[PDB]
Amino acid sequence: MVLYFIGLGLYDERDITVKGLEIAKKCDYVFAEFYTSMMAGTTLGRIQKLIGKEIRVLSREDVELNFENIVLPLAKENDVAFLTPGDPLVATTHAELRIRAKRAGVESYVIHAPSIYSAVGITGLHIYKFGKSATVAYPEGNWFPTSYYDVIKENAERGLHTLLFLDIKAEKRMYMTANEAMELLLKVEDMKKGGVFTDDTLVVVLARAGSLNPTIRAGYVKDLIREDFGDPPHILIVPGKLHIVEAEYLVEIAGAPREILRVNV
Amino acid sequence: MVLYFIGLGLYDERDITVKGLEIAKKCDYVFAEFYTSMMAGTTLGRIQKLIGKEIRVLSREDVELNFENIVLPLAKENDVAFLTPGDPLVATTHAELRIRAKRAGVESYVIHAPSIYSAVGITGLHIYKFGKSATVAYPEGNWFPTSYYDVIKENAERGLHTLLFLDIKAEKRMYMTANEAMELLLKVEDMKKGGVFTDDTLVVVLARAGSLNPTIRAGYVKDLIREDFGDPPHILIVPGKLHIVEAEYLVEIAGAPREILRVNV
Ligand SMILES: Nc1ncnc2c1ncn2[C@@H]1O[C@H](CSCC[C@H](N)C(=O)O)[C@@H](O)[C@H]1O
């Protein structure tokens, strides 16, 4: 009669909360999805060993089209767990799954976990200064989406930071790098000439948030464009005007050039 | 030797990540602060029990004025952990403490935990649609804070949702309720008259996020201002232009007036 949405956290199998682990361990069945994002620091095998339950992976279609036929049925007479990377419900489509639960006479509870949305605080940028968020999607064929460019412009205009999720291909397990995202943004700038993203733009890169050794780098595009930030996942951020405290953190902790103390404050 | 910033999560001792727990258990000294936020589901005793160590609680002054005198000295010869509610570097000024660690020659690492910043995903509102965040501070003396009102205005004009952290006076055990936050906003509205927050404004209240049965309510200010949302902590959210799937969730899960389903495109 109970369905539990449990977050797995940021990077590896230990990023689940103690609450999520204990509850998952006592569930009769455990489902999981890895299409909204992936856990680069671990494997399905390692997660299974930690939980002590077999985990049935579900595809985007399994969830969006058949959540009520694959998961909810067992949720009727058993305790079921649905694992997702990060914090449950951050992915836009997940929220409505709770309505499906209600429609089927099934109770649902949410067990939170660290999300990259809040983990970016490790960059030293004030969380309240983050505006609208966006995703840099890979251009494919004749399709060249650039809405994420406008989000940066509107946020920056108001002195707000812009969090950019990088496109993933759960398919080939392909991760878009910050380097690729920057190249894309330079192309869009050249296309829209809005003075929103150039070689002189200050940028922050956060790689492998959640691990004990994430890469936190800050600097101008011209210098970071071809820098190696390590293995995925990569997160890109375009800061708005900085508060002195933010700049000093980026310089002392993220290796930003002293120049940002007089150019971006 | 090293210093660890470890988040404890949203509500109880089990909201800490497994990573944070295994690391806390192995530290020689453990410090913590409980003034930036409040965990209404546990006690210092329960936290100490789970971690198996004595926790020295620090006040705002201990941290803000003597962090490098009380904590950092031990981090040079031992493995030290500093615990905080939610995520350690979210809606706090703890990031600056990492700079103090560097200058004292102490390597620091951050262990994230579920944060209210992302937990609001449980309200059904798309996380990417949240704009700048703000805090509703208790008016003191002849000083009446009102910046948070402008934040809502600015976000709303862009169709973005606004997350309003509510004030807290830990030493005086005062936790601002959504009702008090709504009252203050109506007053600011009377003064500025920007039509930003009125009796007809739709709002969302989230109480005790992280517990298994949080209170999630949506409705007009006139109907919610005197409603009982249970014990604190509380967060207040002023939605912007709603997507149809967001409205359905507010209605189905948060008991909002069915009329909001009729979105004005
Ligand atoms: N479980 C919870 N439910 C509702 N509001 C919460 C909450 N935890 C924190 N808050 C809100 O946030 C304020 C503290 S701000 C500090 C937040 C913390 N770093 C985090 O990551 O969550 C509180 O006064 C309250 O308004």
Residues A198 and A185 in one domain: yes
Bridge partners (DSSP) of residue B134 are: B164
CA distance A94 to B84: 29
Burial class (CB in 10 A: 0-12, 13-18, 19+), B79: middle
CA distance A232 to A104: 38
Single out the residue in B93, B114, B135 at which a domain terminates. Answer: B114
Question: Is the minimum distance from the CB of B168 to ligand 1 under 6 angstroms?
Answer: yes
Closest partner CB to B17 (pick from A92, A114, A209)? A114
Beta carbons of B17 and A14 less than 8 Å apart: yes
Distance B38 CA to ligand 1 centre (A): 7
Question: Is the minimum distance from the CB of B234 to ligand 1 under 6 angstroms?
Answer: yes
List of chain A residues whose C-beta atoms are within 8 Å of the C-beta of residue B127: 90, 92, 117, 133
Could you tell me which residues of B are annotated as the binding site for S-adenosyl-L-methionine? Answer: 10, 87, 90, 115-116, 166, 209, 234
Cβ neighbours, 10 Å, residue B72: 21
What is the extent of the structural domain holding B228?
115-265
Closest partner CB to B122 (pick from A9, A12, A110)? A110
List of chain B residues whose C-beta atoms are within 8 Å of the C-beta of residue A7: 114
Closest partner CB to B118 (pick from A22, A94, A117)? A117
Give the DSSP letter string of chain A.
-EEEEEE-BSSSGGGSBHHHHHHHHT-SEEEEE-SS---TT--HHHHHHHHTS-EEEE-HHHHHHHHHHHTHHHHHHSEEEEEESBSTT-STTTHHHHHHHHHTT-EEEEE----HHHHGGGGT--GGGB---EEEPPPBTTB---HHHHHHHHHHHTT-BEEEEEPEETTTTEE--HHHHHHHHHHHHHHH--SSS-TT-EEEEEESBTBSS-EEEEEEHHHHTT----SSPEEEEE--SPPHHHHHHHHHTS---TTHHHH--
Residues B155 and B109 in one domain: no
Residues A64 and A11 in one domain: yes
- Please work out, in degrees rounded to the nearest 5, the angle formed at the alpha carbon of residue A188 by the alpha carbons of B133 and A153: 25
CA distance A191 to B193: 41
Single out the residue in A90, A114, A138 at which a domain terminates. Answer: A114
CA gyration radius for chain B?
20
Cis peptide before B73 (omega within 30 of 0): no
User: Tell me, what CATH number does A1's domain have?
Assistant: 3.40.1010.10
- B99/chain A closest Cα distance in angstroms: 7
- Please state the domain count of chain A: 2
What is the atom index within ligand 1 of the atom nearest the CA of B89?
19
Distance B118 CA to ligand 1 centre (A): 11
Beta carbons of B91 and A128 less than 8 Å apart: yes
List of chain A residues whose C-beta atoms are within 8 Å of the C-beta of residue B164: none
Residues A136 and A258 in one domain: yes
Distance B171 CA to ligand 1 centre (A): 16
A115 a known binding residue?
yes
Question: Is the minimum distance from the CB of B166 to ligand 1 under 6 angstroms?
Answer: yes
Beta carbons of A17 and B253 less than 8 Å apart: no
Q: Give A255-259 contacts, CB < 8 A, sequence gap 24+.
A: A255/A217, A255/A218, A255/A219, A256/A202, A256/A218, A256/A219, A257/A219, A257/A220, A257/A223
Residues A230 and A119 in one domain: yes
Phi/psi at A135 (nearest 5 deg)?
A: -125, 130
User: Tell me, what CATH number does A225's domain have?
Assistant: 3.30.950.10
Contact status, residue A164 vs residue A184, Cβ threshold 8 Å: no
Question: Is the minimum distance from the CB of B115 to ligand 1 under 6 angstroms?
Answer: yes
Distance B209 CA to ligand 1 centre (A): 8
A209 a known binding residue?
yes
Question: Is the minimum distance from the CB of B131 to ligand 1 under 6 angstroms?
Answer: no
Closest CA to A18 of B169, B46, B150, B149: B46
Single out the residue in B114, B146, B173 at which a domain terminates. Answer: B114
List of chain B residues whose C-beta atoms are within 8 Å of the C-beta of residue A211: none
**Continuous segment of H or E residues that includes residue B136:** strand B134-136
Residues A263 and A223 in one domain: yes
Query: Count of alpha carbons within 13 Å of B83, Cβ hemisphere only?
Result: 30
CA distance B171 to B177: 17
Residues A74 and A38 in one domain: yes
Question: Is the minimum distance from the CB of B36 to ligand 1 under 6 angstroms?
Answer: yes
List of chain A residues whose C-beta atoms are within 8 Å of the C-beta of residue B126: 92
Residues B190 and B265 in one domain: yes
